[PDB]
Amino acid sequence: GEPVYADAVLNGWLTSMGLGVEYVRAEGNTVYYLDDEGREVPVLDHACGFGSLIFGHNHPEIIAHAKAALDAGTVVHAQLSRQPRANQISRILNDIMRRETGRDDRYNAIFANSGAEANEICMKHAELERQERITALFAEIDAELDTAREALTTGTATLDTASLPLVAGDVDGVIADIHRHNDERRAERPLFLTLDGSFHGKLVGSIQLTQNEPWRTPFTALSSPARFLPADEPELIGKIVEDERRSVLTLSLDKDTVRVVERDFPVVAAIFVEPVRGGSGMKTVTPELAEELHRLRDTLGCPLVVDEVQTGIGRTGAFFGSALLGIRGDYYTLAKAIGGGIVKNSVALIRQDRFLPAMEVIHSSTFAKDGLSASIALKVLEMVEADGGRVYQRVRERGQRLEAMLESVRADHSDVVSAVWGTGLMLALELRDQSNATSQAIREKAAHGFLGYVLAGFLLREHHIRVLPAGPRSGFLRFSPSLYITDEEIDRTETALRSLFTALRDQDGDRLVL
Amino acid sequence: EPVYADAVLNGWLTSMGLGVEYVRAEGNTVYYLDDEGREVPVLDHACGFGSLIFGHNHPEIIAHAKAALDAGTVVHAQLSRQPRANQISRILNDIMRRETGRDDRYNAIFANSGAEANEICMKHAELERQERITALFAEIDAELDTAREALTTGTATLDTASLPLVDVDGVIADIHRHNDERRAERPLFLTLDGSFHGKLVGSIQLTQNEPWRTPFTALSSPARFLPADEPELIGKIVEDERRSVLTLSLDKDTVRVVERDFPVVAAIFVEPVRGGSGMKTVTPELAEELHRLRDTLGCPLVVDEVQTGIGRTGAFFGSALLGIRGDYYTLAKAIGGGIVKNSVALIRQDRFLPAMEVIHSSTFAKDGLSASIALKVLEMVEADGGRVYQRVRERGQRLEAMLESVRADHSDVVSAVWGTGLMLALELRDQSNATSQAIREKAAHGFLGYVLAGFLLREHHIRVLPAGPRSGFLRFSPSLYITDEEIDRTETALRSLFTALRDQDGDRLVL
Numbered sequence A: 001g002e003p004v005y006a007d008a009v010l011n012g013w014l015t016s017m018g019l020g021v022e023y024v025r026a027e028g029n030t031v032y033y034l035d036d037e038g039r040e041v042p043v044l045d046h047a048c049g050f051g052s053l054i055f056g057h058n059h060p061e062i063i064a065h066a067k068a069a070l071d072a073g074t075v076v077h078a079q080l081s082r083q084p085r086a087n088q089i090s091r092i093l094n095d096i097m098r099r100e101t102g103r104d105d106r107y108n109a110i111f112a113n114s115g116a117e118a119n120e121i122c123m124k125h126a127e128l129e130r131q132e133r134i135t136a137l138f139a140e141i142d143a144e145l146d147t148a149r150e151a152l153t154t155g156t157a158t159l160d161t162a163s164l165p166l167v168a169g170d171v172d173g174v175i176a177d178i179h180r181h182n183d184e185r186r187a188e189r190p191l192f193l194t195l196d197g198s199f200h201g202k203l204v205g206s207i208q209l210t211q212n213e214p215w216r217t218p219f220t221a222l223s224s225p226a227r228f229l230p231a232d233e234p235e236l237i238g239k240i241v242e243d244e245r246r247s248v249l250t251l252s253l254d255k256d257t258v259r260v261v262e263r264d265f266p267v268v269a270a271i272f273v274e275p276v277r278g279g280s281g282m283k284t285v286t287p288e289l290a291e292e293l294h295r296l297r298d299t300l301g302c303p304l305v306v307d308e309v310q311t312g313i314g315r316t317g318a319f320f321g322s323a324l325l326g327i328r329g330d331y332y333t334l335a336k337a338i339g340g341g342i343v344k345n346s347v348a349l350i351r352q353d354r355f356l357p358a359m360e361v362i363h364s365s366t367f368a369k370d371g372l373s374a375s376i377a378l379k380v381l382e383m384v385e386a387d388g389g390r391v392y393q394r395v396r397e398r399g400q401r402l403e404a405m406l407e408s409v410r411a412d413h414s415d416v417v418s419a420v421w422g423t424g425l426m427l428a429l430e431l432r433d434q435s436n437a438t439s440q441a442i443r444e445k446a447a448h449g450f451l452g453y454v455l456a457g458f459l460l461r462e463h464h465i466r467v468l469p470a471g472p473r474s475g476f477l478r479f480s481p482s483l484y485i486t487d488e489e490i491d492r493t494e495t496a497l498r499s500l501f502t503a504l505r506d507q508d509g510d511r512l513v514l
Numbered sequence B: 001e002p003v004y005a006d007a008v009l010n011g012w013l014t015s016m017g018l019g020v021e022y023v024r025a026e027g028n029t030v031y032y033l034d035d036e037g038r039e040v041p042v043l044d045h046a047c048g049f050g051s052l053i054f055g056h057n058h059p060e061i062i063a064h065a066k067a068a069l070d071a072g073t074v075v076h077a078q079l080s081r082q083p084r085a086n087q088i089s090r091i092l093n094d095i096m097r098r099e100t101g102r103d104d105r106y107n108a109i110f111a112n113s114g115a116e117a118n119e120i121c122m123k124h125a126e127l128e129r130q131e132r133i134t135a136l137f138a139e140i141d142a143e144l145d146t147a148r149e150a151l152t153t154g155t156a157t158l159d160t161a162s163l164p165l166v167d168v169d170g171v172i173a174d175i176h177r178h179n180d181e182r183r184a185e186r187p188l189f190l191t192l193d194g195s196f197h198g199k200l201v202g203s204i205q206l207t208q209n210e211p212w213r214t215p216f217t218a219l220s221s222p223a224r225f226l227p228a229d230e231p232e233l234i235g236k237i238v239e240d241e242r243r244s245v246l247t248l249s250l251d252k253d254t255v256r257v258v259e260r261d262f263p264v265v266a267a268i269f270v271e272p273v274r275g276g277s278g279m280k281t282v283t284p285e286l287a288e289e290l291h292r293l294r295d296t297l298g299c300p301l302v303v304d305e306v307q308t309g310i311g312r313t314g315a316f317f318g319s320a321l322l323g324i325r326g327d328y329y330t331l332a333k334a335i336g337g338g339i340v341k342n343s344v345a346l347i348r349q350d351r352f353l354p355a356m357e358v359i360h361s362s363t364f365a366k367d368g369l370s371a372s373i374a375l376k377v378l379e380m381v382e383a384d385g386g387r388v389y390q391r392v393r394e395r396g397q398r399l400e401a402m403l404e405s406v407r408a409d410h411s412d413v414v415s416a417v418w419g420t421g422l423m424l425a426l427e428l429r430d431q432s433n434a435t436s437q438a439i440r441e442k443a444a445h446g447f448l449g450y451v452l453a454g455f456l457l458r459e460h461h462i463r464v465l466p467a468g469p470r471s472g473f474l475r476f477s478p479s480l481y482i483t484d485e486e487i488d489r490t491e492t493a494l495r496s497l498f499t500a501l502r503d504q505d506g507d508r509l510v511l
Ligand SMILES: *Cc1c(COP(=O)(O)O)cnc(C)c1O
Pocket: A364, A365, A366, A367, B049, B113, B114, B115, B116, B196, B197, B198, B199, B271, B275, B304, B306, B307, B308, B332, B333
């Protein structure tokens, strides 16, 4: 009935899913809402900012640091001055990367405010690399034209007319039609390669790189497209990228004879990959696929960009998921957990032998590289590295525990659960399709793509546990809690799930759907 | 030695005379350490490029933030009820009504930066454009259906003079072919000359500055930059951009293929006060041209207030001050209170498409901490019957006067004072023909303003930063707590600078 200035549709929808609740306080792995009588009810949080809260909500040590930084009158806005904290942060990340990959590469850091902004820095820099490639090729092509003409008009060579259906009739005329052709091509828009089910952001550039169809397809006309390569079938990937070859024309001299010929054009600006893929449902990159991506990157001459916005800061059980999994990228990006659960920060890391110094003075952003997020970033890095790397060891063993009880629930409920996916504290259950379900109310939700959200509402209202779905038809349930998740909390989750998947088995849509 | 960020950026700042690290900040003052380790106070006229309307680290904002942290505010609460967003949007809606007189209502989508706010608007504009497109293409079908069942059932003949635009069935196919090429063509954005709307893949296309933009041209839809001083040229430029689709029109007896307008323009962007042109305000003449265009093309007018907003012009909304009736608005910078990162797109509710609010999202957006701080900042700028704007206006008047008085005595080097409220700038006269070789070389490289800012820093301990595409303006956008004595110290600093520049003393200016 009444005026409403945000969230109306979003709120309506959440309520019907059974998720209309306001959390008023948070600490550790627990968030609180108020019941009818005004009491705080504790809820266990498995969503955790979609992975942002590796140390839980409002970790005391991070809050203290932030308050100290505020109390010291940290310079938050200090644009175009010396801010050595950036260098300090990038130095630490560089060290960690060496230690986890064995490789001795060095990286330059550009800081931003979100994961999508980090990736789009990489997009932009990739296009800078591509333009350099293009300038170098076109320069060569000129000199190949020059040489062919001063051989063709000075005596010494003839133009083989079998070559001519690429473009003819006459010398200067053919040069023009080649210049024409190449310029059309040069100004054509680049292509990005990404993986099926990829999620790389939702901004004008980065949304094109995100699989999910209702999120992307409305905005298709805005920005350069990506091809989504199939992860399970690496053998199809070679052919798909071949289809995307485009050539430019030039004149090649063989002392005596001159021919017009095709010559490779760089259309692909970059290849993007997630070590663990949210939108496919926490599926990790296989060694097979990593090797295909390395081939492509070697073959095309473009950077491989490793999106660690979600997988990074320890959640997989190393700092870098890529290092765990053996993905040798050329750019890396980071965000989410680096803000410590309280602020917004992100970073692109770009290898220094590819880095183009223009980028450092032609890209900028008002909020980026601020002092407060900077200081908090140094803190978070301090904390995950502490005590000889014992934090990763705790991530790994907490993850092992949680994967086991998840695997044990599957085993008893395989009629509704297909698979457990993921690694470390970044895990998911795959639900079996329920579009053919007995219960009319369940089946209708499944048809609408809302099954997972509905199940998450059951978990909430009946077991006070907060889970959120992943995947394009909300067909996965995500678990990415903090490393402080207790065994008793993991037991309470096992109880909750067995209850859920027994109701689903029984097809009890009265209980599941509101 | 090894170096992991900022090497080139730092090298450059040092040579401009701006290589300094600020270690602490309070009010309108930031501090660096001298050779002996003493804190040196510097007056800050840059102020986060306008973010610090209440100065660095305002006690009242710091206290609020610490309290919010101490209460265990829910920062990450995605996909739950976060009523603070609604509360923030409600307040902005009330302020807008009071300043425009208009009784329009606005929906809020929150983001993490000004560029993200604007790109929400870009995206939503394209959603509006796709709806337009679906409606037109639907009509065109029914115009085709009707023409064919008239052409094959007896009753009409196809006028063959029309045909060099494109058998019957063959022509339908070639029309469908044609229209689909057009449909998938990329949209156009209109913006103003010298516009700055962001530096992300989408928003960079909307930013004039050439070395920032032109490397990335191929990535995203282009914008046409319309000339602000010459509104009369704008009509023609937008005409050149017309594109048609083909359809079949029946005149009972006779049937003709004809051109029909296609919506290519997704949105028009404008800043009430234009950073990249050097704090030039939109004239009534130009506002009226923009209103024409928007009425004419059927696309939204997007008002970028990322910089001009939260009071800096002397109203909350610069657009309201200046009479720009936009359809979307965006806000950022000062709404983060000088300590956090927040932004918002406001979109009118009769244009708003509800899909947007469940198909766009962002991990950091709408977080609890920035939210609470946003409510605080709004509290503060609205307090005491609107006395804060009155103070912005009268502080701005003071500062504009001494700037205007410096110009008058140094018009041989200063062209103009631009801007309004506490958002002001001096325009420098071209020095590419300067006597001093060192000055002239810097001016040629586009580095003149930065060099002058280094003089101001090292000799008068004042922090100014340039604006404009050849760094040919000096910006002044201090906090509303700027004192008269601070404004006097700036007048002294400038007279000194512009006397050295007059004398062409490149030993003193260029280092
Ligand atoms: C700074 C600025 C922007 C971009 O703000 P960010 O937070 O850096 O994205 C957009 N428009 C104007 C007028 C600006 O001054």
